[PDB]
């Protein structure tokens, strides 16, 4: 939503520490998606659970590939995030 600060890219569970790239720095990588209804060249918004859903987008995130399923609910999609809209 409007409270987004950054994105978590790594977690050390032993120390319970999450490494985060701030929203001011652009990123290109795989992120969790709400479902498999996302195609290439689609505007994506972060939901309340921190998952990317297909589109009032405060940030500009565009999907590079389609949703790929690994587990029953794990959906990984390659996305590039490059700041905030206006």
């Amino acid at each position: 939503g409007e409270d987004l600060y950054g994105i978590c890219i790594d977690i050390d569970e032993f120390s319970k520490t999450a490494t985060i790239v701030p929203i001011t720095n652009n990123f290109e990588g795989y992120l969790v998606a709400k479902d498999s209804t996302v195609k290439v060249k689609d505007k994506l918004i972060f939901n309340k659970d921190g998952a990317l859903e297909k589109v009032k987008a405060t940030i500009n995130a565009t999907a590079l590939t389609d949703a790929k399923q690994i587990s029953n609910e794990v959906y990984l999609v390659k996305v590039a995030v490059f700041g905030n809209k206006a």
């Binding site: 050390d12 569970e13 032993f14 590079l64 590939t65």
Partner: protein, 313 residues
């Protein structure tokens, strides 16, 4: 330098463990000649002659004679330099991750410099081999999202102005139809004076399975493989024919000569992976390194490669 740089010593002591590329089997020892370049082009010029019209009869007195023209072609080969980056553990930080059996954090997927460099190098070579065969760079099974490459950079399968045969979807499993297309392509091949040379065939594993079936009522002691070898031997002056199977290919058959005069491979001497001097260091235990490789340098004559595509759709 080895006393001062630990990474340089580490690579030199692990360079032997990296396996040789499989693309070396696809070419003769004389077909490969290294060049000194990293990014640029190499151009060559070829001269041809042609007849403008019918000859002129020399009877009585005549001044207007028929002419023979000439033309030149400049052939350019492009080279591209590409780089990859990988993360590894710092040399000083190794001792704090050296467990009894394994070395490195299993949870964090962190490895020492030597083992990380070895695994990274092998992956790069696999990508290089895939390019030399298919002519394209991609990391998806579908083959989409290919890297846009410079022109004059072609592989064995995407080389233009070669004989291309397509097998229809209905005849995908009919080996007779497949061999029919091979025969048509072999007819259209134009080896010229370089016919007396060995030949190389590359097939996908599915094709290799269809080859061993008896030749077709079923024959005795005659299989589709034997028929194909004889058919190629008809046009190569009965020279040796080598058949290879590659998992990289899929429903494709590739036939081309092993003569340097027709097809030659001129890769950069720095094509194979080479470590970079720059190492990213920080206050933590994680470091970054870079590997460089060069792509390009395949030269072939027109209409000397047969490309058979079995439409599986």
């Amino acid at each position: 330098l080895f006393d001062e740089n630990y990474y340089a010593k580490a690579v030199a002591n692990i360079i032997g463990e990296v396996k040789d590329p499989i693309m070396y089997k696809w070419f003769s020892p004389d077909q490969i000649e290294d060049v000194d370049l990293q990014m640029g082009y190499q151009k060559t010029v070829k001269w041809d002659a042609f007849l403008n019209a019918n000859p002129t009869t020399i009877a009585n007195e005549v001044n207007t004679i028929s002419t023979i023209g000439f033309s030149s072609e400049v052939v350019r080969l492009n080279y591209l330099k590409l780089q990859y980056k990988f993360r590894h553990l710092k040399q000083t930080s190794e001792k704090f991750y050296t467990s009894d059996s394994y070395i490195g954090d299993i949870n964090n997927n962190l490895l020492p410099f030597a083992q990380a460099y070895k695994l990274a190098s092998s992956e790069i070579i696999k990508l290089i081999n895939h390019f030399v065969l298919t002519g394209t760079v991609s990391i998806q099974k579908d083959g989409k999202n290919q890297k846009r490459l410079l022109p004059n950079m072609y592989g064995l399968l995407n080389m233009p102005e070669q004989i291309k045969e397509e097998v229809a979807s209905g005849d995908k499993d009919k080996m007779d139809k497949i061999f029919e297309k091979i025969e048509a392509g072999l007819s259209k091949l134009e080896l010229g004076d370089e016919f007396s040379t060995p030949m190389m065939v590359i097939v996908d594993p599915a094709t290799s399975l269809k080859l061993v079936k008896p030749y077709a009522a079923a024959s005795s002691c005659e299989k589709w493989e034997d028929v194909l070898i004889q058919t190629i031997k008809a046009i190569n002056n009965r020279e040796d024919v080598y058949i290879e199977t590659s998992n990289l290919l899929k429903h494709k058959i590739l036939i081309y000569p092993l003569n340097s005069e027709l097809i030659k491979f001129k890769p950069s001497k720095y094509m194979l992976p080479t470590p970079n001097e720059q190492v990213d260091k920080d206050s933590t235990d994680v470091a970054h390194s870079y590997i460089d490789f060069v792509l390009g340098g395949l030269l072939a004559t027109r209409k000397t490669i047969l490309q058979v595509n079995i439409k599986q759709s």
